Amino acid sequence: VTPLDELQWKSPEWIQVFGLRTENVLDYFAESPFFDKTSNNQVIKMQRQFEFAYVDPARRQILFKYPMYMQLEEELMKLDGTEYVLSSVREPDFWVIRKQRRTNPEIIPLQDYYIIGANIYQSPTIFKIVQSRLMSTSYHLNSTLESLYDLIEFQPSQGVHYKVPTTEMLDKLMVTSI
Amino acid sequence: NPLPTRFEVELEFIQSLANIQYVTYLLTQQQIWKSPNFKNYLKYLEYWCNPPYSQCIVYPNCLFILKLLNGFMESAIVNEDGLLEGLDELPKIIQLQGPQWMNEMVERWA
Amino acid sequence: TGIKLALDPNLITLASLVSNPHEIYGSMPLEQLIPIILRQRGPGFKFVDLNEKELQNEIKQ
Amino acid sequence: DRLTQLQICLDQMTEQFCATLNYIDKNHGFERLTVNEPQMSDKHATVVPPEEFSNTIDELSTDIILKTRQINKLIDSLPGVDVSAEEQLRKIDMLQKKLVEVEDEKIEAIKKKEKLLRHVDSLIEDFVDGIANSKK
Amino acid sequence: VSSLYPPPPPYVKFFTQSNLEKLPKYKEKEEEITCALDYLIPPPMPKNQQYRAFGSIWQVKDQLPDLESMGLTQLYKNYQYKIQELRKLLKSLLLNYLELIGVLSINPDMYERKVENIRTILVNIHHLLNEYRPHQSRESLIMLLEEQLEYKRGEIREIEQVCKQVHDKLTSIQDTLRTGS
Amino acid sequence: LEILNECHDELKALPMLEQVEFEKNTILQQRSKINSTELLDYATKLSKFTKIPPTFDKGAVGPNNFIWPAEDALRRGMLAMASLHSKELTRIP
Amino acid sequence: VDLVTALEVLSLGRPNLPTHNFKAKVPIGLILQRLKDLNLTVSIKIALMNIPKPLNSYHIKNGRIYFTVPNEFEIQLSTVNRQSP
Numbered sequence: 001v002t003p004l005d006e007l008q009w010k011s012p013e014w015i016q017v018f019g020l021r022t023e024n025v026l027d028y029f030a031e032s033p034f035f036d037k038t039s040n041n042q043v044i045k046m047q048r049q050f051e052f053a054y055v056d057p058a059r060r061q062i063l064f065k066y067p068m069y070m071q072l073e074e075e076l077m078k079l080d081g082t083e084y085v086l087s088s089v090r091e092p093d094f095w096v097i098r099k100q101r102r103t104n105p106e107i108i109p110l111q112d113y114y115i116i117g118a119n120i121y122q123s124p125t126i127f128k129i130v131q132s133r134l135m136s137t138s139y140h141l142n143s144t145l146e147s148l149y150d151l152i153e154f155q156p157s158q159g160v161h162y163k164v165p166t167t168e169m170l171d172k173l174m175v176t177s178i
Numbered sequence: 179n180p181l182p183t184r185f186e187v188e189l190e191f192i193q194s195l196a197n198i199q200y201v202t203y204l205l206t207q208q209q210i211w212k213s214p215n216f217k218n219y220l221k222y223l224e225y226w227c228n229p230p231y232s233q234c235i236v237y238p239n240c241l242f243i244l245k246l247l248n249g250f251m252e253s254a255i256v257n258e259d260g261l262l263e264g265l266d267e268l269p270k271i272i273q274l275q276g277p278q279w280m281n282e283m284v285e286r287w288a
Numbered sequence: 289t290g291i292k293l294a295l296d297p298n299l300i301t302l303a304s305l306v307s308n309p310h311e312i313y314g315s316m317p318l319e320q321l322i323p324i325i326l327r328q329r330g331p332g333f334k335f336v337d338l339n340e341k342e343l344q345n346e347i348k349q
Numbered sequence: 350d351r352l353t354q355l356q357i358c359l360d361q362m363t364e365q366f367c368a369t370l371n372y373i374d375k376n377h378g379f380e381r382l383t384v385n386e387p388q389m390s391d392k393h394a395t396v397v398p399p400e401e402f403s404n405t406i407d408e409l410s411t412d413i414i415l416k417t418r419q420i421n422k423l424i425d426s427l428p429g430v431d432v433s434a435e436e437q438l439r440k441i442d443m444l445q446k447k448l449v450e451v452e453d454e455k456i457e458a459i460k461k462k463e464k465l466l467r468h469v470d471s472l473i474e475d476f477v478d479g480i481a482n483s484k485k
Numbered sequence: 486v487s488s489l490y491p492p493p494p495p496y497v498k499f500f501t502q503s504n505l506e507k508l509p510k511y512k513e514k515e516e517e518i519t520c521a522l523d524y525l526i527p528p529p530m531p532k533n534q535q536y537r538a539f540g541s542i543w544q545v546k547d548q549l550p551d552l553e554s555m556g557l558t559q560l561y562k563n564y565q566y567k568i569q570e571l572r573k574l575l576k577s578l579l580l581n582y583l584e585l586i587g588v589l590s591i592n593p594d595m596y597e598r599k600v601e602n603i604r605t606i607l608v609n610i611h612h613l614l615n616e617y618r619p620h621q622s623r624e625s626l627i628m629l630l631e632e633q634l635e636y637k638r639g640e641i642r643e644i645e646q647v648c649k650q651v652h653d654k655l656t657s658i659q660d661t662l663r664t665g666s
Numbered sequence: 667l668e669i670l671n672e673c674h675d676e677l678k679a680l681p682m683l684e685q686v687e688f689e690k691n692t693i694l695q696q697r698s699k700i701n702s703t704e705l706l707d708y709a710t711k712l713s714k715f716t717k718i719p720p721t722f723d724k725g726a727v728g729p730n731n732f733i734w735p736a737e738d739a740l741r742r743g744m745l746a747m748a749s750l751h752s753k754e755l756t757r758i759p
Numbered sequence: 760v761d762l763v764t765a766l767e768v769l770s771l772g773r774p775n776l777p778t779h780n781f782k783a784k785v786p787i788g789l790i791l792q793r794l795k796d797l798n799l800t801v802s803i804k805i806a807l808m809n810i811p812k813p814l815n816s817y818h819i820k821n822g823r824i825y826f827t828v829p830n831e832f833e834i835q836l837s838t839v840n841r842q843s844p
Contacts, residue, residue, distance in 0.1 A: 287732065290701060441702055538743070709765035711765075
């Protein structure tokens with residue numbers, strides 16, 4: 001079993017059928033397992049299918065750049081709970097979706113999900129990244145240290161050392177010949 | 179719908195060696211190259227090299243990949259416990275030379 | 289089926305795969321050709337070891 | 350390879366047709382039925398001088414039919430129009446036999462070059478060991 | 486949620502050493518499976534010769550489909566006849582484009598069947614080209630055999646070119662040897 | 667003697683005898699291997715795959731399926747359902 | 760139609776690509792031919808070279824020329840072409 005962070009998720013079948021642009025990242029992420037099936041985003045999506053403060057300027061550029069997200073957040077301010085908004089975009093292919101709960105207003109952020117090359121990734125926290133790197137480093141130095149120790153030989157007549165595995169007048173002849 | 183025949187499944191798997199992503203997905207599991215049955219299957223599959231079995235192949239670079247990996251097999255000896263020595267570093271060769279082979283055969287496509 | 293076909297295998301593209309070891313060794317000039325010769329002859333091989341009668345009775349085997 | 354250029358010429362016909370239709374749909378003007386009716390212009394409309402409009406119409410038309418002469422000449426130059434598949438096999442088998450024969454002929458040609466090769470190296474080795482015995 | 490790639494087949498489990506040694510004995514003695522020794526003999530071609538692979542049907546010997554078999558209009562059906570058919574087809578294509586311009590320059594609503602006519606002309610032209618393609622491929626193989634003939638014979642002419650350079654340089658050395666005599 | 671030396675070394679630049687003898691052997695081996703109808707049928711099988719399509723500008727189309735099976739080709743292919751129906755493939759009498 | 764790759768399949772069972780890994784070999788007839796033409800090379804190299812009386816004893820053999828002085832030394836030398844020493 002692999003938990004939620006170490007998996008890259010994509011639906012190229014959904015890319016073949018619909019295609020991914022700056023507009024349809026929401027339902028593409030809804031098809032991803034990262035999406036909450038009890039979120040406020042999907043209930044307002046079912047309801048709609050049937051300047052502004054308390055936001056950072058990074059989302060404000062998105063709202064003033066794309067309309068469907070600004071009536072998305074205009075429907076989202078009415079309700080409360082976990083939501084899904086796109087903080088930054090880079091056409092042709094880069095997106096990010098943040099988990100976000102809103103209370104009345106007060107907003108905290110949560111886990112993000114960056115999209116690269118129409119492939120949904122869970123944004124990892126850096127502690128387990130450097131922890132995995134240190135797993136690799138520590139195991140590798142463990143292997144080096146164990147593989148080194150078998151070559152080490154100690155004698156009492158000398159110091160501790162390594163296991164030993166099981167003409168000089170020609171330069172003067174050269175310099176005298178010339 | 180009849181069952182997929184042994185010919186069809188073996189042809190689709192032998193054809194899948196043209197993509198390097200499939201083989202670098204397969205070679206990262208230790209139990210796959212550790213298994214001597216998979217090694218024998220690798221020496222089973224050269225019957226696609228001879229006609230008329232080669233006629234149905236669409237991308238012959240899979241046959242090239244099959245012929246390439248077999249040169250790493252005579253240097254490998256299987257023991258009584260099943261540890262296949264010599265296969266610890268061949269997948270590393272695959273990730274080091276991965277883009278090289280497929281870019282080379284893409285430029286041969288052009 | 290039909291009839292067979294024999295092709296010049298070395299040249300298929302107009303203006304290689306068949307490794308005939310003669311045109312891929314005798315074409316190059318000797319000054320850089322000798323190094324790969326004594327590299328492929330053996331490890332630690334020297335120019336002093338090459339001989340007439342050695343190759344003359346090596347082809348006789 | 351000729352059929353490939355033919356297909357390129359065919360969809361070049363189609364691109365020329367849609368390009369001429371696009372040009373005549375977008376860059377046409379507004380024609381006076383009478384002189385007393387008002388002639389208005391739009392800043393969102395690509396108005397062109399009518400004389401160079403007609404000149405561009407003429408050059409579009411002439412490039413269409415010069416590409417048409419290219420198509421006709423290329424189809425006149427299609428490789429093999431009078432031969433059948435049986436004629437193709439009757440060419441292939443004699444080409445097979447001729448290739449086997451010219452491999453043989455190249456074998457005796459290389460044999461003659463080898464005649465000359467050991468001739469010239471025998472003269473060279475006789476010359477050099479003669480002068481080596483002379484000068485020693 | 487499953488893996489990205491399918492697993493290796495269950496047929497790999499039968500490749501055991503007992504099966505390897507019993508394979509020549511079984512040889513001395515679409516498949517109907519009877520025992521484990523059937524999985525070491527490679528399976529023959531399907532009798533239907535149309536096998537499913539990668540969501541499509543291939544064939545052991547592909548034949549070019551007709552327009553009627555595919556469900557379209559084959560206007561015209563040893564290739565001189567097809568060459569003249571192609572010539573009439575291209576002339577009809579040019580005339581039908583002129584007719585399409587005429588239709589759009591009186592009534593831009595009746596063009597729909599004219600576009601269908603242009604479609605039929607184009608698909609007949611393309612299918613005629615693909616019918617000529619095995620003949621064109623045979624001509625390409627003829628060209629390749631002629632090109633290898635030409636390269637062998639060009640090797641011949643360069644052989645006697647270098648040889649004649651040897652002969653007239655030999656006449657030169659004979660002349661200068663007689664001069665030095 | 668030196669002009670005979672350049673004559674000898676320019677004549678040395680030609681292919682030798684056993685090279686074309688081995689070439690003849692390979693030509694007869696290809697006589698053994700290749701059949702004309704088989705070659706043309708197999709070559710026109712690969713006609714739409716092993717080269718770039720000489721009709722597009724290839725700035726919007728790539729070799730996802732032209733040289734190797736694509737990811738989505740394996741997804742929609744019958745091998746994908748062969749993976750799910752592998753239990754029936756394990757059914758051996 | 761793509762005749763070259765079908766020819767590669769019907770020849771080897773694989774297309775032609777450069778091989779950085781095993782999937783060279785020097786002929787012994789070729790190396791003896793090059794040995795004897797290099798012996799001819801070093802034999803005609805000393806045609807333009809004057810030879811001293813202490814070193815007129817030489818043996819053009821084994822791809823070399825054996826410049827020898829009796830009971831003193833024997834040095835064997837070779838060249839790559841004519842214009843280089």
